[PDB]
Amino acid sequence: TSVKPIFSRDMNEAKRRVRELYRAWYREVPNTVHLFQLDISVKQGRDKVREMFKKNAHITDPRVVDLLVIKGKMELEETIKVWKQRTHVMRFFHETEAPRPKDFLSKFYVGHDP
C-alpha cells in the first residue's frame, strides 16, 4: 500500500476522530428540533444517530474510515446552520414509504423476485 493517507495513520487517530464528531451530533440533536419548527419527540432524533454509526463497523482498513469522516464532518455545516429548509432533514425518516415484506412468503404473493 504505497499511498499517503488523508488524516490518520493506523487505527488509533481514526478511531478517536470518529468518537469526536459523535459528541457534536449528540449535542446538535435538540437544537434543530426547534430551529426548524419540527414537532416530534427529541428521543427520536437521538435514536437515528446511534443507529447510523453502527452501520459501518465492518471495516478492516484505514483511509476508508477517514473518507466517511469527511462526509460526517461536512453535514455539520448545513445542519448546525440553516441551509436545509425543513425538508432535506426529514428525508432520513421514511414516513411516507410503505413497509417492505422482508419475509419469504409475503414476497411470493406480490412481486416477481425482488
Partner: protein
C-alpha cells in the same frame, strides 16, 4: 489534398515541437511523457507528486508564462488500474500557445490542490469533489456545489445510472415534499449504433 480538407502548417508543428522539448529536459523528476497533438497542441504527462511544482515552474518564468488557467476538468476511465484523469489547461498570454497537464490519479490517493498557485481553481475543485469524489488535499473551503443535499452517488461517473434513485413528488399526507423510489413512465430505450468493419486503419490496435 483537395478543397474541404483542412490545410495544416509546419511552422507551429515545428515550434511547439521544439519548445516543449526542454520541459522534459529540465524537470526530469516529474514529467514522464510528452506528446505533440497533430492539431498543434501540447500534452504533458505528470506524476501526481508534481502537481504543484510543474505548475509553479510554469506560473512565473521568462520563457513560459502560462498565466491563465482556462479549464480544469476530470475524466473517469474504468479499466486503467488507476481510474480517473485530471487534466489541467493553461494559456500563455505573452506567446499565444496552449499546453495541457494530464495527471493520473485514483480515488483514495489525494491530490495536493492547486489553490495557492492559481486562485482560479477555487471553484473548479469544489465541483470535481461533488462529481467524482476526488479528495483534493488542504482545500480552504470544500463544500457541496451543483448537487442536491441528498445525493450520495457522485453522478458524473460510469456507475451512476442515468436517472437517479430518488424520484421526487408531493403529497398532502402531511405538508411535506417527499422522496420515493424511482418510477419511470417510459423505458428509456437504449439503441445500438456501433456498426462493424473497423473503418479506421491508422488508429488500429496491436493485433494480439
Amino acid at each position: 489534398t483537395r478543397p474541404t480538407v483542412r490545410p495544416r502548417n509546419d511552422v507551429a508543428h515545428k515550434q511547439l515541437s521544439a519548445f516543449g522539448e526542454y520541459v522534459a529536459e529540465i524537470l526530469p523528476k516529474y514529467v514522464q511523457q510528452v506528446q505533440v497533438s497533430c492539431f498543434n497542441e501540447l500534452e504533458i504527462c505528470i506524476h501526481p507528486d508534481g502537481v504543484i511544482p510543474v505548475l509553479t515552474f510554469l506560473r512565473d518564468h521568462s520563457n513560459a508564462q502560462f498565466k491563465s488557467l482556462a479549464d480544469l476538468t476530470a475524466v473517469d476511465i474504468p479499466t486503467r488500474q488507476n481510474r480517473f484523469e485530471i487534466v489541467y489547461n493553461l494559456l500563455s498570454l505573452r506567446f499565444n500557445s496552449r499546453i495541457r497537464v494530464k495527471t493520473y490519479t485514483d480515488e483514495l490517493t489525494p491530490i495536493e490542490s492547486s489553490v495557492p498557485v492559481y486562485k482560479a481553481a477555487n471553484w473548479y475543485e469544489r465541483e470535481i469533489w461533488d462529481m467524482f469524489g476526488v479528495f483534493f488535499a488542504n482545500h480552504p473551503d470544500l463544500r457541496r456545489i451543483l448537487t442536491d443535499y441528498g445525493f450520495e452517488g457522485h453522478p458524473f461517473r460510469k456507475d451512476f445510472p442515468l436517472s437517479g434513485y430518488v424520484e421526487l413528488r408531493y403529497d398532502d399526507e402531511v405538508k411535506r415534499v417527499v422522496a420515493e423510489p424511482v418510477e419511470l413512465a417510459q423505458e428509456f430505450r437504449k439503441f445500438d449504433l456501433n456498426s462493424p468493419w473497423e473503418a479506421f486503419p491508422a488508429y488500429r490496435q496491436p493485433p494480439e
